[PDB]
Structure 1
Amino acid sequence: STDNAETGVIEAGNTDTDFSGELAAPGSNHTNVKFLFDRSRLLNVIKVLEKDAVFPRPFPTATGTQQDDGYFCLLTPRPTVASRPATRFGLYVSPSDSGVLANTSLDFNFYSLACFTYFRSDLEVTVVSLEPDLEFAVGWFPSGSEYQASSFVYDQLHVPYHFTGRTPRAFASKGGKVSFVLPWNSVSSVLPVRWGGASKLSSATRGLPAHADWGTIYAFIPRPNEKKSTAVKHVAVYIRYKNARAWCPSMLPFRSYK
């Protein structure tokens, strides 16, 4: 019908508006935000700790720093790099062996439907092993805490300080999984899917939120540091957004035409 799209509001018509027709019956409510993000999906495949770690030092990290990379999973749909939140998402195309390949992550199923700016939800974290008969454990520390990185000698065995704490270290049975729901613990009222301000941090970068995360999990093996194995064991972190709310509609990513 006769309209003005320069107005900015176009009323959603039906077939009966211009023609002779009828309204179709409403099919289903699967587009509900609380329904559509309330399902699990893979976030990041992280290695499993076998000793007391060294958490990745903040950027710009110089060479020679003996730290432990690819062990901590900053639980965020936004793009991360080296277990710390980033802006751009980078994947290595031809990863030659000069320098440390930084473990990046992103929630591919989220941004293809993240047609909004702010998003708040609880987080159900399921940590599925990627190793036959792995008895692991899933430590965690909230948004705004740091990793306790040393070891205390119990009975001539370097038991690290990430076995205990006031934060949930769920121990898995052998051949089992770990699943627990994390509350919204960040200091921001919502998580910015898209952020345009500047974080007044270690040198300020536009478009990088400081506390848009549910925390950081890491997997360790419940043995002291003398019982260290040799081969590298991985674990996979699935994530479900319980009780999702979303505000302020925005864009969906640019699907190319080639």
Structure 2
Amino acid sequence: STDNAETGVIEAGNTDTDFSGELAAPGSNHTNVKFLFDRSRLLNVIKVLEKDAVFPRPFPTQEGAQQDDGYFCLLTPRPTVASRPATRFGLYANPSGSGVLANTSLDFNFYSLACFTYFRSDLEVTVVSLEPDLEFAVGWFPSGSEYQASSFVYDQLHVPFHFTGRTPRAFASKGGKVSFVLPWNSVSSVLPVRWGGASKLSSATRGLPAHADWGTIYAFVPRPNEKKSTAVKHVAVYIRYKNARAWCPSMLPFRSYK
């Protein structure tokens, strides 16, 4: 049928427009945005704390600084590095040489279906053990805060402060699982899938949002400082968006042609 594509708006047609025929029945509605995104998926894998921690310093950190790495996980589909927001995803193709290796993460499915510009939704978290018959706990604090770092002495046994606080802490039995849901607590109204502004008024890095996440999570062993074991331990984190919404179209990744 004759038409002009330069106008931008083109009306969708059917088989009957130019030939003899008829339209098909609806079928099913599995493409609904709310129904599509309510499925759990892996996000990151982190270690388990066995003592009081030292939060990593900002990125301009030079050598020789003492801190703990790979113990904290951010809750956000965007790329991150060293437990802090980033802009470019990383990958170590040559595990050799000096220097500490930076943790990295990303939400492959979310960015494979990230066809829009802005997003908002609640979020449900779950954790799972990767070691046989392990006892652990999980802690959390909201966006725009920091982790207290010190300990107290009870009966000559040091006890880290992160045991107590008015922000959720949860315990699981031998081989159990931890589950709960969180609200949308960032100051911004919506989470930007892609951004092009600056946060600070000067010396800022363009395109790096400040508070595009839900919070922060970590795991620890409920024992005093006197029982620091000899082997490292790991856990896995699962997230699941709930009651999602989208606001403005965009484009999808570039599938390279061999």
The question of a shared fold, defined as TM-score above 0.5 by the shorter chain, is answered with yes
Distance 1:26 1:257, change over 3 A: same
Distance 1:108 1:202, change over 3 A: farther
Shift of 1:224: 1.2
Share of identical aligned residues, percent? 97
Residue matched to 1:205: 205
Distance 1:250 1:167, change over 3 A: same
Shift of 1:206: 0.9
Deviation digits for residues 47-74 of structure 1 (CA, Å, limit 9, x no counterpart): 1111111111111111111111111111
Shift of 1:86: 0.5
Shift of 1:3: 1.9
1:150 lines up with 2:150 in the alignment: yes
- TM-score relative to the length of structure 1: 0.96
| Mean Cα deviation higher: 119-128 or 17-26 | 17-26
Residue correspondence of structure 1 range 208-223 to structure 2 within 5 A: 208-223=208-223
List alignment gaps of at least 5 residues for structure 1.
none
Structure 1 stretches of 4+ with a deviation exceeding 6 A read none
Deviation digits for residues 99-157 of structure 1 (CA, Å, limit 9, x no counterpart): 11110100011100011111101010111111111111110111111111111122222
1:163 lines up with 2:163 in the alignment: yes
Shift of 1:233: 0.4
| Mean Cα deviation higher: 112-121 or 165-174 | 165-174
- TM-score relative to the length of structure 2: 0.96
Q: Distance in 2 between matches of 1:160 and 1:124?
A: 27
Shift of 1:42: 0.4
| Mean Cα deviation higher: 128-137 or 4-13 | 4-13
Q: Distance in 2 between matches of 1:72 and 1:85?
A: 12
Find the structure with the greater CA-based Rg.
2
Shift of 1:203: 4.2
3-state SS of 1:44 partner: strand
Residue matched to 2:18: 18
Q: Distance in 2 between matches of 1:66 and 1:26?
A: 61
Deviation digits for residues 22-66 of structure 1 (CA, Å, limit 9, x no counterpart): 222222222111111111000000111111111111111111111
Shift of 1:95: 1.8
Deviation digits for residues 150-194 of structure 1 (CA, Å, limit 9, x no counterpart): 111222221111111111111121101111111101111010011
List alignment gaps of at least 5 residues for structure 2.
none
The CA RMSD measured in Å over matched residues stands at 1.3
Q: Distance in 1 between matches of 2:12 and 2:148?
A: 56
Residue matched to 2:246: 246
Shift of 1:240: 0.1
Residue matched to 2:38: 38
